[PDB]
Every structure is written in C-alpha cells, then in structure tokens.
C-alpha cells in the first residue's frame, strides 16, 4: 500500500552536486508529481527514509555510506535505494544492494567500475558516466582526424573522491576500446610546483591533442606556461575536461563567458593563451521543462531546505535524480500492471533499461547497460571578443556531433593541427 | 563474565593461509591455553561467533566480509574481531571496526594502506606486512651497494586479491621512503605471451637488480628466457618475491630444495638459469614451540576440522593468529588488572603496541604502529649441488642481516654485480 525509498546521500554537506540540500527538493518535486498522476502508483503513499553518506568530518565516506545502507535496510526494508553520488561511497553500497536484490538509482557514481553491472546488478545510473565521455572524445577524434595519439593530464586533491582520476579512467578505457590509439596519461598534484616543469615538458613530448582534468586555476596556469613556452593553437590543442563547467558562469545570465578573466593583470596574457584551449562540458538541457524545474527547485530548496540553489551545470544531477525517480515509479507501475510486485527488482530494472524517457532534462535514454546516455557540449572562444561559447554538441544516444548556432571550431591554422608532429616528436 | 570474539575469515574455502580449516584449530589451541592459564582472564569463558568472508563463489569478498562483520556486531556485540586476511575483505571490515571502537586482530591484511592506523584504528597486525618487505630490501641494498636502481616485475590473476600488487606496493613505497633510489615497476599477465618479449626487453633496459613477484612457473619461464637471451649472474640478479615459498617444499623434510626441477627435460637448462636467481621468503620459526604447535595444529585440524594441514611457510599465518590472540588476552587481563574493561579498545590496543612477546612463532615484536616486525630469509643455490638453501636471514626488529650456517651469497663474479651497467643502460 506504500513504497519505502531509502536515500544515502550527503544530508548535511551542501557542496556536492548530489547533496540532499539540492537533491532533496528535486525528489520532493518528483514525489509530488507522482501524487498528481493517477497513472503512476495510484493509491500508494511513497515514503522516504534518509541516511547520510558523510562521515564525522562531513565528506562522503567509504564507511559512513555503507553503514547507513545496512541501517536503512534492516530498519525499513526499502524497495529502492537513492544515491550515493560519490564513487567510493556508491561502490560498497552498490555491492550491498546488489546482494540484497534491491534496485539502486543514482545520478552519480560515474566511475568505470560501476558500469560492470554483472557486479553492480540492479544499479541504474540516470546521470553522467565517464565512459560516455570516452564516447564523445571518440566521436571528436573521428570527426577531426586525430587517430594516433593523445596526452591526458589529470590531478586530484588528496583524500577527495578522485573525480579527475575516474573521469580520466573512463575516457581512457572507452577511447582505447573504440579507437585503439595511443593515450598517454600523467597524474600531477595541483599545489606542487615541481610538477609544472614536468607537465610542460610532457606536453611538448607526449602529445599534441591534449586533455587536462584539473581546477580552472590549474588549467589557466598551465595555459599561461604553454604560451610562455611557445605552444600555440597552430600545433597544440588543449581540452579542459570541466564537465560541470566550474571554469564558466551559468547559462542563464552573466553574458558573456570568460574563463581566462581573473583580475590579476595576467588576463591579457591568458586570453592569448586560451586561443589554443577548448572546454568540454556536459550539455545544458534546452527544454522549457528544465527551466521550470529550476524555478521550482530553487523555490522548494529555499523553503523546506534553507538552501539557495544557484544556476549551473551541477543542477542536472538533481534534475536526473528527479527524472530517475519518475522513471522508476512508472516501471513499478508497469510491473504492478502485469502482476508483479514492487520487489521484482529484475523486472523493474529491465523495464527501465534500454528505454527512452521524457523528463525535466528532456529526452533521456537509458542504454542496454542501465546507464543514461550523456550529451556533451564543446566550448570555444570567439577570436573577436575572446568570450567562449558552445560551438559543438554531442547527442549521446545518436553519437552525432552537431554544429551549434552556425559556429565554427576556431583554429589558428584554419584546420585542426595533427595529433602527431612533422618528423616525429623528436 | 565472558568474552565474545567475532571471527570473519573463509569458513569454507580451505585455500587461504588464513582459512578457518587452518586458523580455527590454531585459535582453539590458543583458547585452550587461556583456560590452562590462571594468569590469563581467570573465570572468563571466551566465546567465539563466526562469519564467513567468502561470497557465493567461495572466494574472499569485499562484500560478504563487511556484511558478516555488521551481522556479528549487532547480533553478539563482540569485544574483538579476528580476521579477515584478504586485503579487499579486511579494508571495509577494518574501517567498520575502527568506527565501532572495537579492536581488530589479523595475521593477514598485509597491504600498505592498512598501515595507516589513523584510519584503521585499533587494527593490530600480528602476521607479515608488505612494508616490512621494503625494510628487508632496504637492508639488502645497503649491505650490497645497490644504491641506484631496481626493477620490479609483478603479475596477478584477474579477480584475486592482487597479492603481488600489494607486495610490490609495500616494497616500492617503503624502499623509496628509505633509500630514494629509482624503483622501476612493470605489471604483466602470466598467461599472456605478448608480455614476455616486453618483460625481457624491460629486464635488459630498466634494471640489473630485478625483483619478480609471480607464480613459480612464471618465474622459472622468465629465468629460462633470460638464460636463452644471455642474462647471467655476472650482470643480473633475479629475486623471486615468493614470501610463502610456493616455489619450495617444506622445511621439515623433502631434502634437498630444487625449484628449477620440473620434469619437462628443461630441468638441466633451468638449473643453469637459476644460478642468477635468489628466492626471498618469510623466515621459518626456529623455536621448538613452533614445531610442537605444528603437531597439535595438525592433530586438531584433522580432528575437529576434517582438514589436513601440510607443512609450509603458510602455517605461520595460523601460528600468528594463535600468538596474537594470546597477546590480546594478556592485554585484556592487564587492562582488567587496572580497573579497565574489555571494551577499552584504546587501552587494550596500546598495551599490545610497541611490545615484545613470546609465542609459538618465538620472539615476536609489535612495532609502534601495531604491526608485527617480519623476519625474512634469503635462499641461494649451492653451485655444487644446485639445491637452494637459506644463506641470509633478516631480523625485522633489529633490521640486521645474519649469515646462515656460514654460507656465502653465490655470485658468478665473486661479488654482486652493480645495480647500474658499464656506460649506462644503453
């Protein structure tokens, strides 16, 4: 007569894209719509029991989360888990829920290993995956002739959820799975100056198509050093792997978009450097339902969560929990419609998998693997104004690259430089 | 009035050094001796509650184990945990017990990260650690002039507990922590022939002091190829990191010791190749208490466990569970002796830490970090007979290398070859 939903997310830390201050009101919106829909679980009263994935220090934990999951499992016997979003939190919890035969929904946990559904059974991902980033890069290389070699620089703050590592891991594995070109990789530490001679040396020794996963300030400094060292767009192309667009403002206002602007008198030098730099991000959803969702999310978060939700790419995560939750409710309704029960985790999961759906994020497609196809935008600077704007968009379900607003990809040489230099790298 | 000991080990699979079929009777011996000692917990009736760390496929699990730990914790509220031995089982469980303020004892979990007692609080290791291997290697290099470069080749079977990886991790980190010499490293897959050209190439390109962590057959094959490729003891030295002596028979009978012998007509060629190879192992405990312990362990395992315990270095793991258990009981008795309780996990842990003890394994020292100092033996072949015998022993607590039975370290050039070649590696 009622559906028990277990949640394991950061209930107190509001810094994560999947923090409860942000996913909470999005879920609240999703339940409220279930109530207003006589075609979704009529009569059921979906209840939610929460558990904090964060430890005593307030960061998502490889210990607090799995403990929370067991506590909710024996105390309420839920039918589905919601979250976690952190990789090291989601991995133990996913294995627990997989063993329990309980479906798991999350718009986080993008790491390569979660994709092994043979292990993370009944885990459905409705947000981004890092293999999907490999799909974008593959299509990018295919559409630009880079079929030999790339270099990947990545860095993480010690003790974090290693987001760049998992980003690079997904990109790395998927790209070599599909293209089999040489993908060199180097980890560095952002605060360590010793690494910057090394990185610069490796940039001009290990690749010309170069992807960097780092903070905006790190990517800016590396660009300034590359220009200082004579590395321009005629030979090098630097892709900042900034999937949440930390180096950009929101797509709502703040016109125009200047990531090289910093106010330290280096801005004139950074704009020239950034002529060789392009930013890869997730795609902002276009549909008007998304914008109406943002308005309600902001209102409900400020109301019942004392939190202020600002505009940005991070809001697709709560949007995806919202959509994921509706996608589940329909599946359960469908399973009930054919004599199943809410505990037929495999029937429910398979109803969600290999399926297209319409949510506040617009069209979303769950692949055969239980993972949402992920769309990516490519940003490039206008050589006239210097501001960055989307010039290319990638549909994750159709794997097509579509030019945006009749823009062209800026190249100092008129065409992209080759991923291999003249007479070798020597 | 009674002490509840929670156990999380492989209760059914008898393939692990820390399998219950082998650690069980060693523990039962320890309990029986607590009964016979009026100075160890007089009146207490120590009970044990078991939990299997293995999953449905029968291998130690990163999921079955932590699940088992929570189950014993809420069902029996134990005072101490025993096991697990596998790294990926021990890491989640250790983090749980640490959060629970419950002490954890294990003769397994030798991985580097378990050494971070800031995280794995109240975890005491009474068997080997892989950093202790780095201690031995450090002392070996210091005593042989290798102060520049080493190369490390390791391989694991997919889906196992990655024993060689963690062995090499500990060696690598500890050795660079103390010597700061260049330690090159390469992973391979034993069953993949593509790697053998690569390895041989790397052998003659990346080092002359070479450590290989692999199966015995893999190490034999690599030796045969190195001889076939003209790599002799005058320039190369190959250390097999065979800590459990899988490539050797037991120290009890089976005289003499021939790892290159295989019965495939290649044995004559393998003996010449193995003149450049030395085997690093754990040290067999000398003390007669050990031998008496092996007799009783065998009797009790065949009696109440339907298992046949055979001779080998692996028996030090159940010997160390046995010793560590007594070491704990004394600590508890000491804590009780000063008004404490059996739940003062910190008081009890600190009583066990930085402490020497006399067990069936002889003298064992717990360091300031909660880890048993680990002694190592070095095996070498007699150029006359070709059989391998211990020629060097390392006392982990004193970090001294003592010649064994007046033997000398065999060198085709009379002295060890330099860890760097003539005019560089080119």
């Amino acid at each position: 007569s009622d559906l028990t939903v277990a949640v394991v997310l950061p209930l107190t830390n509001t810094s994560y894209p999947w923090s409860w201050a942000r996913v909470g009101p999005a879920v609240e919106l999703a339940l409220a719509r279930v109530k207003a829909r006589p075609d979704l679980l009529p009569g059921w009263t979906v209840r939610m029991v929460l558990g904090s994935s964060e430890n005593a220090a307030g960061v998502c934990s490889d210990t607090a989360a799995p403990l929370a999951a067991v506590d909710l499992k024996w105390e309420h016997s839920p039918a589905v888990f919601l979250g976690p979003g952190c990789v090291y939190s989601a991995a133990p919890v996913g294995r627990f829920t997989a063993h329990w035969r309980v479906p798991l929904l999350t718009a986080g946990a993008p790491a390569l290993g979660i994709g092994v559904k043979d292990e993370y059974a009944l885990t459905t991902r409705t947000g981004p995956s890092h293999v999907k980033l490999g799909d974008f890069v593959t299509a990018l290389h295919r559409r630009l002739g880079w079929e030999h070699q790339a270099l990947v620089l990545y860095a993480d703050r010690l003790g974090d959820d290693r987001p760049c590592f998992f980003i690079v891991e997904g990109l790395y594995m998927r790209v070599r799975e599909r293209l089999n070109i040489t993908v060199n990789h180097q980890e560095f530490v952002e605060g360590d100056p010793d690494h910057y001679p090394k990185l610069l040396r490796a940039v001009r020794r290990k690749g010309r198509v170069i992807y960097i996963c780092s903070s905006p300030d790190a990517f800016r400094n590396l660009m300034l050093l590359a220009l200082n060292a004579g590395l321009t767009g005629e030979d090098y192309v630097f892709f900042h792997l900034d999937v949440f667009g930390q180096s950009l403002k929101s797509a709502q206002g703040l016109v125009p978009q200047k990531p090289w602007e910093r106010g330290d008198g280096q801005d004139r030098s950074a704009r020239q450097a950034f002529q060789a730099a392009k930013i890869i991000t997730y795609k902002e959803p276009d549909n008007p339902e998304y914008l109406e969702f943002l308005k309600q999310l902001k209102l409900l978060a400020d109301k019942k969560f004392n939190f202020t939700v600002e505009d940005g790419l991070k809001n697709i995560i709560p949007a995806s929990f919202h959509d994921g939750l509706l996608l589940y409710v329909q599946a359960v309704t469908e399973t009930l419609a054919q004599g199943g029960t809410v505990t037929d985790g495999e029937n429910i999961t398979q109803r969600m998998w290999n399926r297209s759906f319409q949510g506040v994020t617009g069209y979303l497609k769950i692949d055969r693997n239980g993972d949402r196809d992920t769309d990516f935008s490519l940003w490039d600077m206008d050589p006239e104004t210097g501001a960055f704007r989307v010039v290319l968009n990638y549909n994750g379900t159709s794997q097509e690259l579509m030019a945006v607003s009749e823009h062209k990809l800026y190249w100092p040489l008129g065409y992209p430089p080759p991923d291999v230099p003249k007479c070798g790298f020597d | 009035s009674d002490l509840t000991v929670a156990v999380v080990l492989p209760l059914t699979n008898t393939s692990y050094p820390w399998s219950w079929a082998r650690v069980g009777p060693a523990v039962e011996l320890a309990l029986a001796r607590v009964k016979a000692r009026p100075d160890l917990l007089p009146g207490w009736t120590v009970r044990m509650v078991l939990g299997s760390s293995e999953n449905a496929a029968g291998v130690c699990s990163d999921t079955a184990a932590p699940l088992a730990a929570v189950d014993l914790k809420w069902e029996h509220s134990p005072a101490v945990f025993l096991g697990p031995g596998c790294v990926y089982s021990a890491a989640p469980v250790g983090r749980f017990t640490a959060h629970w303020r419950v002490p954890l004892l294990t003769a397994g979990a030798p991985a580097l990260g378990i050494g971070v007692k800031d995280e794995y609080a109240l975890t005491t290791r009474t068997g080997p650690s892989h950093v202790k291997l780095g201690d031995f290697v450090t002392a070996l290099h210091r005593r042989l002039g290798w102060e520049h470069q080493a190369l490390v080749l390791y391989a694991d079977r997919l889906g196992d507990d990655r024993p060689c990886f963690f062995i090499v991790e500990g060696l690598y980190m500890r050795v660079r922590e103390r010597l700061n010499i260049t330690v090159n490293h390469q992973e391979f897959v034993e069953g993949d022939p593509d790697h053998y050209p690569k390895l041989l190439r790397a052998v003659r390109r990346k080092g002359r002091v070479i450590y290989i962590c692999s199966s015995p057959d893999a190490f034999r094959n690599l030796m045969l190829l190195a001889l076939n490729a003209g790599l002799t003891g005058e320039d190369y030295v190959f250390f097999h990191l065979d800590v459990f002596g899988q490539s050797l028979k037991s120290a009890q009978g089976l005289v003499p010791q021939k790892p290159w012998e295989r019965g495939d007509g290649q044995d004559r060629s393998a003996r010449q190749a193995f003149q450049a190879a030395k085997i690093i192992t754990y040290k067999e405990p000398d003390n007669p208490e050990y031998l008496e312990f092996l007799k009783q362990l065998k009797l009790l395992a065949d009696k109440k466990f339907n298992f046949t315990v055979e001779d080998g270095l692996k028996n030090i793991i159940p010997a160390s569970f046995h010793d560590g258990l007594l070491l704990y009981v004394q600590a508890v008795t000491e804590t009780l002796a000063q008004g404490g309780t059996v739940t003062d996990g910190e008081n009890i842990t600190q009583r066990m830490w930085n402490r020497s003890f006399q067990g069936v394994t002889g003298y064992l020292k717990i360091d300031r970090n909660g880890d048993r100092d680990t002694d190592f033996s070095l095996w070498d072949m007699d150029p006359e007979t070709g059989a391998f015998r211990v020629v060097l022993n390392y006392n982990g607590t004193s970090q001294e290398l003592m010649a064994v039975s007046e033997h000398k370290l065999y060198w085709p050039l009379g002295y060890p070859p330099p860890d760097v070649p003539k005019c560089g590696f080119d």
Partner: peptide
C-alpha cells in the same frame, strides 16, 4: 593503472600509473 576496483586501499601508490606524486 585503470580498472582496478573502487577501494581507497588500491589507491595508496598508483604503482601501475604514471604519477609525479607518491
């Protein structure tokens, strides 16, 4: 370097990876 589980116990040195730290 990549594909080896998701436990911090396996990220204490890299050792398969190309890193300047550790």
């Amino acid at each position: 370097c990549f594909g080896g589980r998701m436990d911090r116990i396996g990220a204490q040195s890299g050792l398969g990876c190309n890193s300047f730290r550790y």
